[PDB]
Amino acid sequence: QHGCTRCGKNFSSASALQIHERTHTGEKPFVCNICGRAFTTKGNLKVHYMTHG
Amino acid sequence: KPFVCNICGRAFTTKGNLKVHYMTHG
DNA sequence: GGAAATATTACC
DNA sequence: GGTAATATTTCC
Ligand SMILES: [Zn+2]
Ligand SMILES: [Zn+2]
Ligand SMILES: [Zn+2]
Numbered sequence: 001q002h003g004c005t006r007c008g009k010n011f012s013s014a015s016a017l018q019i020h021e022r023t024h025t026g027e028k029p030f031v032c033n034i035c036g037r038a039f040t041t042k043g044n045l046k047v048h049y050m051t052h053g
Numbered sequence: 054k055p056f057v058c059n060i061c062g063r064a065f066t067t068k069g070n071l072k073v074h075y076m077t078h079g
Numbered sequence: 080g081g082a083a084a085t086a087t088t089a090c091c
Numbered sequence: 092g093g094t095a096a097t098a099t100t101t102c103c
Binding site for chain 1: 093094099
C-alpha cells in the first residue's frame with residue numbers, strides 16, 4: 001500500500017506513487033524535443049512523439 | 054490487438070483486456 | 080521485487 | 092485525436 005498524502009489514492013508501488021504525485025507538483029520531466037511539450041511520464045511523451053511523424 | 058469487441062468494435066492486445074472491457078456494455 | 084513500459088481508460 | 096492518469100504487464 002503506497003498512499004498519496006495529498007489525496008487518499010493508493011498505488012501499486014513507490015514509483016507509481018511517484019508518477020502520481022506529479023499530478024500535484026506539476027513536475028513534468030519528459031519534454032518533447034520537437035515541440036517542447038512536457039509530460040509527467042515517458043510513456044505519454046513516447047505516444048505524443050508519434051503525433052509528429 | 055487481435056481481440057475484437059463485437060459490440061463496439063474496439064481491438065485489444067489480449068483476451069483478458071477484451072473480457073474486462075465487455076463488462077462496460079452490460 | 081519494484082522500476083519501467085505498456086495498455087487502457089476518461090475526458091473532450 | 093491526443094492528453095492525463097493508472098492498471099496491468101513486462102523486464103532486469
Ligand atoms: Zn495524490
Ligand atoms: Zn511534440
Ligand atoms: Zn466494446
